[PDB]
Design a protein around this ligand. Structure first.
Ligand code: W2V
Length: 165
């Protein structure tokens, strides 16, 4: 199972790790994708997870969108985890670079509560434009299930741990 994590709270754990490499190693029941409403996995975590599936995630996602239409900002859907996990929970955090309401970040993290344990990135961080320190705070104050956070950047990981209240 999960190794080398720092325990932040009763249920939140954090590690400086590449979430693709972490998913390939652990093969968790659920890996969270930092999705957009269209499930267009172009960059950031989504681009990396999709590339690790050899584009199978994007093909499955395009069929999901063709059937169901776009997700809501703050929403999610469960799709296959392909070669990375049993399932992928595609969660849409607000993209500050698109002018989306940061208050939807709590709604986005509430999707994690439907799964007992997840491997996840910080929602709305990175190319989504939000402050990762704030994202971690909302995560610990919203998620009650066991969440193993993978933070790609070592420098950001150190800043998140050193500033954690
Ligand atoms: C391959 O995934 C990456 C690659 C680069 C950056 C990120 C984001 C994900 C959101 O939190 C902040 C960043 C981080 O983890 O350091 C993810």
């Amino acid at each position: 199972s999960f190794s080398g994590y720092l325990k932040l709270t009763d249920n939140v754990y954090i590690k400086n790790a590449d979430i693709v490499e972490e998913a390939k190693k652990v093969k968790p029941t659920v890996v969270v994708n930092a999705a957009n409403v269209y499930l267009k996995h172009g960059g950031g975590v989504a681009g990396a997870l999709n590339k690790a599936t050899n584009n199978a995630m994007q093909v499955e996602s395009d069929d999901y969108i063709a059937t169901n239409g776009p997700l809501k900002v703050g929403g999610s859907c469960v799709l296959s985890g392909h070669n990375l996990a049993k399932h992928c929970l595609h969660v849409v955090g607000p993209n500050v670079n698109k002018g989306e309401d940061i208050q939807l970040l709590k709604s986005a993290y509430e999707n994690f509560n439907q799964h007992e344990v997840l491997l996840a990135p910080l929602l709305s961080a990175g190319i989504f434009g939000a402050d990762p320190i704030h994202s971690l705070r909302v995560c610990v104050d919203t998620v009650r299930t066991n969440v193993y956070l993978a933070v790609f950047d070592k420098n950001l990981y150190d800043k998140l741990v050193s500033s954690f209240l």
